[PDB]
């Protein structure tokens, strides 16, 4: 067995049928989900016909006791029923099988299990940050399947064991990620902050420097990012 | 022997 | 009556269109969460499908396990949020304040009963106002099947049957022609047997109970009914 998170093929083969099941349970209420829809556009179609006849002339709308019942009932009942159909709830089935299949998902310590798996292997063989997101995508081109996020949490779990190399690596390809535009939920101060103090600490002091200008620029409040800037401005000069 | 009808509905 | 000036008839058909384009944005929004959901189901279909095409690839690259796992304990709770999502709180808020000014059971029952004074009055045919063949009705309004069935109910009530014959057979005529209704011959039968049989037509309520008999063979009034008419004629 190939070395890294998982024990054995089989492990791996029963979660992703898991997760098949669950896209398939999730296509059934998108297909339910549709048809309400349809329904319900239907019925808007047929009320916005109905709604500009009376409009026309509301008086002699009305005014006539068969328009008058047909007005009464469809905002008596009709309205009624149509909320109703809207209040309806499509999810049920889904939801339901998904809170069911949820004893057989990983949790918080496999998470970060696969995350220092991934993280021995990468230091363990040399491996640079393209060859670990490009994984076993078919092809000779480069696809990376990893968000900013995804970078900056690897990043902070090496960042934790001190391995400030790796910290650096992961670090600066989020940064490189949020810089081309990338939406997301991690913000760049907070990478710089960690960034920052992994590259001081594997020597770079121009790069610890500029990196702290970059995050003044960001946010000139910075209590800490000033006093840094302060300091190696101070030691650079010495 | 059958009743005779009762209301509908 | 409902309406006790033409300003209130006028402000509450002007409030029904503006919900009708309540409406309409509604639907926009909850267009736009299901096309979301597609787009997430779409990408999740992929994911799955390119790790059973490698197996051992897959679990022989690390940034697979990390992103499964992640997938799974967090992204999918992301997506279960967005699934219970709610778009309709604008409408039906909206539309909850409107029912202020909407008529309620008592006024529709009033307009019923005034349609059906109407048909007595001027001897209006079923057929004549279903179809909306009256001065200005045509093409503004028409009647269903179940509108019939609830006009034939009214006159039940106020026991009226021959106005209830009348109206359950307008139902059935219409659903004989291939409406699509929420009404079933059924219920329709029921009410139109009881009438005919109230204006002393012995052998039509036969024939009608037997006709429900053969949509609902285990209908208990309607089994006693066919006994009973069965009893009766035998007697004359």
């Given at each position: ?72 009932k469809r905002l008596n ?23 069911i299949q949820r004893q ?48 900056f949490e690897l990043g ?83 | ?9």
């Open positions: 067995m190939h070395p890294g998170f998982f024990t054995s093929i089989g492990q791996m083969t029963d979660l992703i049928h898991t997760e098949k099941d669950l896209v398939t349970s999730l296509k059934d209420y998108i297909k339910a989900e549709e048809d309400k829809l349809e329904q319900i556009k239907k019925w808007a179609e047929k009320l916005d016909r109905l709604t500009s006849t009376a409009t026309k002339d509301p008086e002699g709308f009305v005014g006539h006791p068969v328009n008058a019942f047909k007005l009464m009942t009709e309205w009624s029923e149509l909320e109703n159909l809207v209040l309806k709830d499509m999810s049920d089935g889904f939801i339901s099988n998904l809170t057989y998902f990983p949790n918080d310590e496999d998470q970060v299990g696969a995350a220092k798996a991934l993280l021995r292997l990468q230091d363990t063989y040399n491996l640079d940050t393209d060859t670990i997101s490009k994984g076993n995508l078919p092809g000779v081109k480069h696809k990376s399947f990893l968000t900013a996020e995804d970078c902070k779990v090496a960042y934790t064991e001190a391995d400030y190399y790796h910290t650096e690596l992961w670090m600066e390809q989020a940064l490189r990620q949020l810089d081309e535009g990338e939406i997301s939920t991690i913000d760049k101060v907070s990478v710089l902050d960690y960034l920052s103090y992994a590259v001081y600490q594997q020597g770079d002091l121009d790069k610890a420097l500029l990196l702290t200008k970059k995050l003044l620029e960001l946010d000139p409040e910075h209590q800490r990012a000033n006093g840094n800037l302060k300091y190696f401005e101070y030691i650079m000069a010495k | 022997p059958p009743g005779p009808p009762g209301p509908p509905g």
